[PDB]
């Protein structure tokens, strides 16, 4: 058994992590006080669920997680929430004044002040690890702490933990819930600094989650609670293979080797189905072919893009519940005829499939319906570069006038890092274009 440590950075990273771990406990039957009756090994064990949870001699199960924000209003909710018991205080870290939606303020000014304290608390978790797989880093592109401090921590983690893998769960900015005008700057800068330090990064565009909550859950004006509830489901299905017995994606290294043949193109597109409203007392339960076919509709993707106009380099299917392989092969064969699925010449046209008999778990009182079978598809398609193009265009319009740049320079950063970061994304966009276009 090898361990994984989750790091939640900023407001968005913390609150998503606070939803993921509530969902992890429900899946494994861990109570808010950390007691798991079903664990017959007290004070220890090398079970697969122990990859994400530590154990104490008293019978408590403690997440292998660290929460860091540069202001306490968010983390103090964790210290008082339903699962305040679950964690111990060394895992929760707070500043006093935030990065003010400023990448440079969180990276240079305030990052330098608190980086060493964070690594020490991370080191405390690693000292309890017999074999450490790597890290799972939850953060946002737009926030000052999410973009600035994360990219700094990624650099140090590549040093203090040189050969260990790192996975990002990033929140691509969406104007309908965005709190800052300079998020395009923060996204380009943090992506540039973290590109060579992240082995696999699952982007989530809040636009897609927002519209899914409006379309499929009939929520008039979704909130972060609504968005996080759904994000936790996608995160859980992706990390399920690390928390349960299996042979697919049981190691952080498998994510890279199965999904990332090209180091820089390490941004897979997640697609999830079915998203059904619980207020619908009952619905016709969907077949394996139906939910599998939903995975190729853009309306169910985490980033609104058109995979038909790109090329796949890898594809994985993660089912949960009443699913048998014969149903999957029938669904795949029939789908391949009606859909426009094109792989790169230098990769086989295949699908790595994982099934887990435990049906998806939903939070009580939430907006999501209990379903008996669900699926999440992780495909490394070049069409996700549409997101980079969108974000780069917004960056270009503002930087043509040097709008807001003085806020970054006043924090010690140089105007060169704007051009240097932008050029990297220009190369990344053209890297995506060589692979996926004729």
């Amino acid at each position: 058994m090898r361990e994984c440590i989750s790091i939640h950075v900023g407001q968005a990273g913390v609150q998503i992590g606070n939803a993921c771990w509530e969902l992890y406990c429900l899946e494994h039957g861990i109570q808010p006080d950390g007691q798991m009756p079903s664990d017959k090994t007290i004070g220890g064990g090398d079970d697969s669920f122990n990859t994400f949870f530590s154990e104490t001699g008293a019978g408590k199960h403690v997440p292998r997680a660290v929460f860091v924000d540069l202001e306490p209003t968010v983390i103090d909710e964790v210290r008082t929430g339903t699962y305040r018991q679950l964690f111990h205080p060394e895992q929760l870290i707070t500043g006093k004044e935030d990065a003010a939606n400023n990448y440079a303020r969180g990276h240079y000014t305030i990052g330098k002040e608190i980086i060493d304290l964070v690594l020490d608390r991370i080191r405390k978790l690693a000292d309890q690890c017999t074999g450490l797989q790597g890290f799972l880093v939850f953060h946002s592109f737009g926030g000052g702490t999410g973009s600035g401090f994360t990219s700094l921590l990624m650099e140090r983690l590549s040093v203090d933990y040189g050969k260990k893998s790192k996975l990002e769960f990033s929140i691509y900015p969406a104007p309908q819930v965005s709190t800052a005008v300079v998020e395009p700057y923060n996204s380009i800068l943090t992506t540039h600094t973290t590109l060579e330090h992240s082995d696999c990064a699952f982007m989530v565009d809040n636009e897609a989650i927002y519209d899914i909550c409006r379309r499929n859950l009939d929520i008039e004006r979704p909130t972060y609670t609504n968005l996080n509830r759904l994000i936790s489901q996608i995160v859980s299905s992706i990390t399920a293979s690390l928390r349960f017995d299996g042979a697919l994606n049981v190691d952080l290294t498998e994510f890279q080797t199965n999904l990332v043949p090209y180091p820089r193109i390490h941004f897979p597109l997640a697609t999830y189905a079915p998203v059904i409203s619980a207020e619908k007392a009952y619905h016709e339960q969907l077949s394996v072919a139906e939910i599998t076919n939903a995975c190729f509709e853009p309306a169910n993707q985490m980033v609104k893009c058109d995979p038909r106009h790109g090329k796949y380099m890898a594809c994985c299917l993660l089912y949960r519940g009443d699913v048998v392989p014969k149903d999957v092969n029938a669904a795949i064969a029939t789908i391949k005829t009606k859909r426009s699925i094109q792989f790169v010449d230098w990769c086989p046209t295949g699908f790595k499939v994982g099934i887990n008999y435990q049906p998806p778990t939903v939070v009580p009182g939430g907006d999501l319906a209990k379903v008996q079978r669900a699926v999440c598809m992780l495909s490394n398609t070049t069409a996700i570069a549409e997101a980079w193009a969108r974000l780069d265009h917004k960056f270009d319009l503002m930087y043509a006038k040097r709008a807001f740049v003085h806020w970054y320079v006043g924090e010690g950063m140089e105007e060169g890092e704007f051009s240097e970061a932008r050029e990297d994304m220009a190369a990344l966009e053209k890297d995506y274009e060589e692979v996926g276009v004729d």
């Binding site: 853009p298 893009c305 106009h309």
Partner: protein, 351 residues
């Protein structure tokens, strides 16, 4: 009131559509890179599709289909027809064609068929074309393969070699060649609308089968006919014959009608091409919708068989028909998505 943006100022078709929308009093035009629009009349190359459908509270529509380039460019179209079960390497209405790169390639296969029919002494007049050439140039007709394959290595852009139609239908008086242009509108629902009116683009010089050094008698483009021939304008105004007159000629000279002999094949070819690519370009479940106007070019042989020669994703109309077609675009492709305040000119091809 709705908003729209113009990004191809050279489009003569959508220039009049722009004039029509403003005359509506219900459409305001914004400037090139203002992103808060309902309708984009976009550019012709590198249109940013990835940025559409991401403006909250704005149903965005665009006048091009992403992926149509696979059908509207010679090298792409040849590969599309041969490599699709729908259209079948054994296709009847597309001339025997081959994609050839100067200096994935098919040069070796083109020669296989060339010698195969000089063994049987069948005609070997082939033509080489490409999307790089224009203005009546970038094109060569010859019976000897060596003259053509040397001519392509003389270039630097991919070309296609196609079996020249040696026995075309010749209009009399004049004993002259021609091709047919049909305009097709595909809306966001992917309804295929054929414009009732087509045009015959005419050669004003008799078709000389002996000497191919002469261009004008073989190429029927409205450019070369106006520019390398004085008899341009003798028989019909601007070397443009319209369907009502062509219908009469077929009846009077061949005891048939335009509908039966020719038009029914045209509608079949249009359906087959577009329906083949619907899965790859349809936007009925996307965040942004599409429509596009296509111009199909056809050749007719002496047996009254219809052949397809190319497709234009960004075509131009005929001066007599701009008013009628450009207003039909508004009612069927634009006003269908963005209603206005309160007989048909199109043929709907069912599937």
């Amino acid at each position: 009131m709705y908003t729209f943006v113009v990004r191809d100022e050279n489009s003569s078709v959508y220039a009049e559509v722009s004039r029509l929308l403003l005359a509506t009093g219900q459409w305001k035009r914004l400037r090139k890179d203002n992103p808060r629009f309902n309708l984009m009349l976009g550019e012709r190359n590198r249109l940013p599709f990835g940025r559409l459908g991401h403006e909250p509270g704005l149903v965005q529509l665009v006048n091009y289909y992403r992926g149509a380039d696979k059908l509207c460019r010679k090298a792409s179209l040849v590969k599309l027809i041969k490599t699709s079960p729908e259209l079948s390497e054994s296709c009847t209405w597309f001339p025997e064609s081959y994609v050839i790169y100067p200096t994935t390639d098919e040069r070796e296969v083109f020669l296989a068929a060339y010698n195969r029919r000089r063994e049987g002494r069948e005609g070997n007049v082939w033509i080489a074309k490409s999307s790089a050439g224009a203005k009546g140039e970038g094109i060569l007709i010859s019976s000897e393969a060596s003259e053509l394959l040397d001519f392509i290595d003389e270039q630097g852009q991919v070309h296609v070699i196609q079996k020249y139609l040696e026995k075309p239908l010749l209009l009399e008086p004049g004993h002259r060649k021609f091709d047919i242009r049909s305009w097709v509108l595909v809306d966001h629902l992917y309804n295929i609308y054929l414009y009732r009116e087509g045009v015959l683009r005419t050669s004003s010089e008799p078709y000389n089968s002996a000497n191919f050094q002469d261009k004008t008698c073989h190429l029927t483009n409205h450019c070369i006919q106006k520019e390398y021939s004085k008899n341009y304008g003798r028989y019909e105004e601007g070397n443009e014959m319209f369907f009502e007159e062509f219908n009469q000629y077929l009846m009077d000279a061949l005891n048939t009608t335009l509908e039966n002999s020719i038009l029914l094949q045209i509608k079949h070819i249009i359906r087959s091409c577009l329906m083949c690519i619907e899965p790859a370009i349809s936007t009925k479940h996307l965040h942004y919708q599409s429509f596009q106007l296509f111009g199909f070019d056809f050749m007719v042989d002496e047996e009254l068989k219809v052949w397809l020669i190319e497709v234009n994703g960004a075509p131009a109309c005929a001066q007599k028909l701009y008013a009628e077609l450009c207003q039909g675009i508004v009612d069927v492709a634009i006003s269908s998505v963005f209603p206005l305040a309160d007989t048909s000119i199109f043929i709907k091809l069912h599937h």
